[PDB]
Amino acid sequence: EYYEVFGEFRGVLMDKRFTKYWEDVEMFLARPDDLVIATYPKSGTTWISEVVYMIYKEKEDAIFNRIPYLECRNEDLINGIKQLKEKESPRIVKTHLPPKLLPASFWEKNCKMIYLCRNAKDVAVSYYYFLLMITSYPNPKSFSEFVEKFMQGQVPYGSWYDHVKAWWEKSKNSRVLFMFYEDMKEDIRREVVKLIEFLERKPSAELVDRIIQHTSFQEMKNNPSTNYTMMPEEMMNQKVSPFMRKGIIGDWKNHFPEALRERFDEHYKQQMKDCTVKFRME
Amino acid sequence: PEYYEVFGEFRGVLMDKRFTKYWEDVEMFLARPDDLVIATYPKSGTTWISEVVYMIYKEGDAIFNRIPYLECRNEDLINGIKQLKEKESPRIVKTHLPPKLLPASFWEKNCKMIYLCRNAKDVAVSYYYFLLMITSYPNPKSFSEFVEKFMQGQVPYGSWYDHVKAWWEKSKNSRVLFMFYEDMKEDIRREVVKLIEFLERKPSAELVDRIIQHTSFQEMKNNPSTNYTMMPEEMMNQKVSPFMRKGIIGDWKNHFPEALRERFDEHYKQQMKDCTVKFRME
Ligand SMILES: Nc1ncnc2c1ncn2[C@@H]1O[C@H](COP(=O)(O)O)[C@@H](OP(=O)(O)O)[C@H]1O
Ligand SMILES: Nc1ncnc2c1ncn2[C@@H]1O[C@H](COP(=O)(O)O)[C@@H](OP(=O)(O)O)[C@H]1O
Ligand code: VO4
Ligand code: VO4
C-alpha cells in the first residue's frame, strides 16, 4: 500500500524505513572535511557523484559503497550511517534530504556541499520509472496519477519545489555549490572545471578530459559500479526499467499529455514564482 | 528464472550461482588461528547453535552481522567475506559448505569447528519451506518433487548424505565437535555444558541457565536479532513461511506421504549404510 510504505515525517513524505531510526540521522556526527552531495531523487546524483569521486582520486566497489547514501536504511541489512561511521576521511556523503532534515552537524561544521537539480518535468519522468523499478514501492496507476502526486509533494522526499527553493537559499553560502543537470549536459567541460575548483584542486586537461570520458552516459551505463547492477534485483528490478534509462533532456515530451503539461507548468509557475534559480532554457 | 538458471553445479555441489561467481574470495579466504567455524547443512538449526555459541563467548545486532555467513554473497549489497575481513577476533564463522569446499586456510590453521546435523527427513521439510520463503528461489512444484531433488543432492549445497558423512569423518579431530539438533531438543543442558567446555569456558549453573532460557524456540522466535525479521522481506518473505517455523522433531510425519517416506528411508539406508554417526532415536 502506498501510505503503508510512505508516511509524512516532519512535513515530508518519507520511506518509513528511513525514519524508523531517525535519531541516527539526526544525531549524525559530521567531520569538518565531509562533502555533502544533495539532490532531489532522479536529478543526476550518480553522475555528479562519479565526477566528484574522480576529482578526489585525481572490479571497483559499487558507487553506493564508495559514496554512502546517508539516510538509506533497511533494518540491519542496509545502513548508510553505519557505512559512513566506518568510512575514512575525506567522506563523500549522498543524500536526498531537504535542508531542514539534513543532520545539523553538517551545517554546524560548515561542510562544503554540492546541490544538483534538474528540470521538474524531466525529474518527474525519471522519478516515475524509479518507482516502477523499486520492487517495494507501489507502482503508480499511470504517469498522470503519479504526476498529480508529484505536484502535491506526495512522493518520497516530498515537494520538489520546496526542495529546490530551500537548497537554492542555502546556496547563498559560498561553501554550497548549486548546479544543474542540464548544464552538465550542455556544457560538461565547464561544469567539471567548476567542480574541480570548488573542491580546491588544480584543473588540467588530463583531469578534466579523463572525467568527461569516464562520466558520459554510455560510459556510466556499462560501468557495473555505477549502473546499479551490483544491487540485487529483488530490490531494484532493472528489468522493469534500467537505472541508466535515457540520460537526456526533454523526455517529458514523451510522457506528459498536452493537458497535463499545461496544468503542471501552470502549477510550477505558482510554486517557483518568487524563485531566482536559473534553469537552462530548453 | 528457471531452477538451473539460479543454481549451478560447482565442483560436484549444486550451488547458488551468486555464491560461486566470486569463488576465488572464498577459496583464498584467510583464516585466523582463533576463528571458530560453525558448519551445518541448511535448515539443521544453525541459528540455534549460533546463538548458544555467541552467548558463551559473551559469558551469557542481527545474528547475520554478529556471525557472518562466510560464502553468502549478492554482488556488492551482501558480502560475508567482506564482513569477516572487518570482524575483530575472535571471529565466529557460519557456513553450509561441505568440507571439500571450505576455505583450506581453516584446516591449515587447524581452527576449532562445530558441525551440527539434524535427521534428514526433518531437514527436507524445513529446507522445503526455506525454498518457499526465499523470493529468488523457484518454489518446488510440490513437497514430493522437492524430496526427489533432495535425495539426488540436487538442492543448494548438494547431497545431505555426502555433507554429513564427510563432516562426520572430519569430526575425528578433537577440534571438530559433531552435534545433533535432536540432542539439543531432548537434552539442552548437557549439550550446552558440552559446548561451553569445548570452547574452554567454565560451565556455571547460572551461565547454563541463562543460555537455556535465552535460546529456547519461543524466545528466539520473538527475538528480532535471531528470527530474521531484520532481513528485508524482498529477500526473505516470512509471510510465505516464518523462519522460526515449528522448531520440533518429527514434522516430517505431516509432509511425507507413506510411499515417499518408505522410498526416502530406503534410499537413506543405502546412502548411509556404513556411516557410524549416531542419530538420536525418535
Ligand atoms: N552520466 C550521465 N549522463 C546523463 N544522465 C545520467 C548520467 N548518470 C546518470 N544519469 C541519469 O540520472 C537519472 C538517475 O538519477 P539519480 O542518479 O539522481 O538517481 C537517470 O535519468 P533518466 O531516467 O531520465 O534517464 C539517469 O539516466
Ligand atoms: N531455539 C530453537 N529451538 C528449536 N528449533 C530452532 C531454534 N532456532 C531455530 N530452530 C529451527 O531450526 C530451523 C532453521 O534452520 P537454520 O537455522 O539452520 O537455517 C527451523 O526448523 P523448522 O523449519 O523445522 O521449524 C527452526 O525453527
Ligand atoms: O535519486 V537516485 O541516486 O537514489 O536513484
Ligand atoms: O540454514 V539457515 O541458518 O542459512 O537459513
CA distance A78 to B126: 27
Inter-chain touch A75–B135, beta carbons under 8 Å: no
CA distance B163 to B124: 14
The three three-digit cell numbers of residue A225, written as one number:
559500479
Ligand 1 centroid vs A241 CA: distance in angstroms?
12
- In this structure, are residues B241 and B133 in contact, taking their beta carbons and an 8 Å threshold? yes
3-state secondary structure A63-120: HHHHCCECCCEECCCEEHHHHHHCCCCCCEEEECCCCCCCCHHHHHCCCCEEEEECCH
Q: For residue B55, give Cα distances in angstroms to A221, A259, B67, B195.
A: 47, 64, 12, 11
Q: Compare all CA atoms of chain A with the CA of B61 and give the residue at the minimum distance.
A: A76
Q: Specify which residues B95 forms β-bridges with.
A: B39
CA distance B54 to B51: 5
A15: part of which helix (H) or strand (E)?
strand A12-15
Cis ω before A32 (30° cut-off from 0): no
CA distance B77 to B84: 15
Strands A92-95 and A35-39: parallel
Q: For residue B254, give Cα distances in angstroms to A183, B74, B246.
A: 66, 34, 12
Q: Specify which residues A15 forms β-bridges with.
A: A6
Q: Is the CB of B215 under 6 A from ligand 4?
A: no
Name the burial class of residue A82, with classes exposed (0-12), middle (13-18) and buried (19+) by CB atoms within 10 angstroms of its CB. Answer: middle
Among candidate residues B145, B98, B121, the one with its CA nearest the CA of residue B267: B121
Among candidate residues B228, B265, B254, the one with its CA nearest the CA of residue B46: B228
Q: Where are the beta strands (DSSP E) in B201-264?
A: none
3-state secondary structure B1-60: CCHHHHEEEECCEEEEHHHHCCHHHHHCCCCCCCCEEEEECCCCCHHHHHHHHHHHHCCC
Residue A16: phi, psi to the nearest 5?
-55, -25
- In this structure, are residues B216 and B226 in contact, taking their beta carbons and an 8 Å threshold? no
CA distance B29 to A50: 31
Name the burial class of residue B245, with classes exposed (0-12), middle (13-18) and buried (19+) by CB atoms within 10 angstroms of its CB. Answer: middle
Q: For residue B130, give Cα distances in angstroms to A135, B3, B63, B125, B206.
A: 21, 15, 18, 9, 35
- Greatest CA separation found in chain B? 52
Gaps in chain A (C to N over 2.5 angstroms) fall after 58
Buried-exposed string B16-49: b where 16+ CB fall within 10 A, e elsewhere: bebbbeeeebbeebebeeebbbbbbbbbbbbbbb
Q: Is the CB of B47 under 6 A from ligand 2?
A: yes
The three three-digit cell numbers of residue A214, written as one number:
569516464
Handedness of CA B76, B79, B85, B87 (dihedral sign): positive
The three three-digit cell numbers of residue B133, written as one number:
520463503
Q: For residue B204, give Cα distances in angstroms to A44, B56, B177.
A: 60, 11, 21
The C-alpha of A60 sits at a distance from chain B's nearest C-alpha, in angstroms, of 10
SS3 B206: helix
A179: part of which helix (H) or strand (E)?
strand A176-180
CA distance A30 to A110: 10
Chain A partners within 8 Å of B65 (Cβ):
76
Buried-exposed string B72-107: b where 16+ CB fall within 10 A, e elsewhere: bbbbbbbbbbebbeebeeebbbbbbbbbebbbeebb
SS3 A14: strand
SS3 B92: strand
CA distance B75 to B79: 7
Among candidate residues B99, B138, B146, B95, the one with its CA nearest the CA of residue B121: B146
Among candidate residues B111, B113, B101, B94, the one with its CA nearest the CA of residue B42: B94
Active site residue B163: no
The torsion region of residue B240 among left (phi > 0), alpha (psi -120 to 50) and beta comes to alpha
Resolution expressed in Å: 2.1
Q: Catalytic: which of A96, A214, A255, A267? A: A96
Strands B73-74 and B36-40: unpaired
- Greatest CA separation found in chain A? 51
Q: Does domain A1-282 have CATH number 3.40.50.300?
A: yes
SS3 A254: helix
CA distance B126 to B114: 21
- Integer-rounded Cα radius of gyration of chain A: 18
Rounded to 5°, the CA angle B219-B224-B115 comes to: 70
Q: For residue B255, give Cα distances in angstroms to B125, B151, B185, B260, B279.
A: 7, 15, 21, 9, 21
- In this structure, are residues B118 and B44 in contact, taking their beta carbons and an 8 Å threshold? yes
CA atoms within 13 A on the CB side of A262: 3
Chain B partners within 8 Å of A62 (Cβ):
75-77
Interface of B with A in 74-113 (CB under 8 A): 74-78, 86
Strands B92-95 and A92-95: unpaired
Indicate the domain borders of chain A.
1-282
CB contact set of B257 (below 8 Å; sequence gap of 6+): B144
CA distance A252 to A273: 21
**Which amino acid, one-letter code, is at A96?**
H
Handedness of CA B58, B61, B63, B67 (dihedral sign): negative
Alpha helices in B134-250 (DSSP H): 143-151, 160-170, 181-186, 188-198, 205-214, 217-220
